[PDB]
Amino acid sequence: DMYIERAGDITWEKDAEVTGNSPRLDVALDESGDFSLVE
Amino acid sequence: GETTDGVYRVMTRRLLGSTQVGVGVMQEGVFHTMWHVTKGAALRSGEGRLDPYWGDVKQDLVSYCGPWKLDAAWDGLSEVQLLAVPPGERAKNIQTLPGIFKTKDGDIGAVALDYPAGTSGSPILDKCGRVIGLYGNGVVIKNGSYVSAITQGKRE
Numbered sequence A: 001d002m003y004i005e006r007a008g009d010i011t012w013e014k015d016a017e018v019t020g021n022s023p024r025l026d027v028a029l030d031e032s033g034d035f036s037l038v039e
Numbered sequence B: 001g002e003t004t005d006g007v008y009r010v011m012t013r014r015l016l017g018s019t020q021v022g023v024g025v026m027q028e029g030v031f032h033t034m035w036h037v038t039k040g041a042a043l044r045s046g047e048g049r050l051d052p053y054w055g056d057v058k059q060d061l062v063s064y065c066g067p068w069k070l071d072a073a074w075d076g077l078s079e080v081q082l083l084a085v086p087p088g089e090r091a092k093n094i095q096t097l098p099g100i101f102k103t104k105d106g107d108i109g110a111v112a113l114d115y116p117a118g119t120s121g122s123p124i125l126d127k128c129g130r131v132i133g134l135y136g137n138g139v140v141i142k143n144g145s146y147v148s149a150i151t152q153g154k155r156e
């Protein structure tokens, strides 16, 4: 049996850690909701 | 039980100790999460019970107590914030600029931040604090890293 616990508020925080690149990927989505790369 | 708006951890006691299997959003009395987190199973909030209402395996989304309410969308230009809720660690906002998933049916946003599988269902926000989608369903690139899609549902 699964249960839920509060983890916080949903708000934008100014001065947050800015990280991560922005890649353009060619992807496919199957009937099972699974993404896969196409090259 | 507790239906206050906010981000929540999805836990289970079936495995060893208390294992976090995912995350979700409580907004307008409806709990939104990814289908692979709960598999459509009923959730518990203290003494209260949350029963599934809508779900789809291809979209990988599921809503509890009512229909999907989140309908904000990434504008295709701005930076976004992933409110990451990692297992055993405190909720944390990580700002990033999303990439693109080019598909046969159209383009989708993508956040390139690697987090444990238990972080699945953590919301992605715009500068207004609106939920533009959920993190947790994506792909593994040549670098071994994880690039998730910005998965949003539909509000009728």
Ligand SMILES: Cc1nc2cc(Cl)cc(C(=O)Nc3ccc4c(c3)CNC4)c2[nH]1
Pocket: A032, A033, A034, B036, B060, B115, B116, B117, B118, B119, B120, B135, B136, B137, B138, B140, B146
């Ligand atoms: C290497 C890796 N890192 C991850 C990080 C996060 Cl947050 C999730 C995942 C992850 O397995 N997602 C996931 C799992 C099952 C299904 C779907 C998606 C959709 N169809 C069913 C990760 N995998």
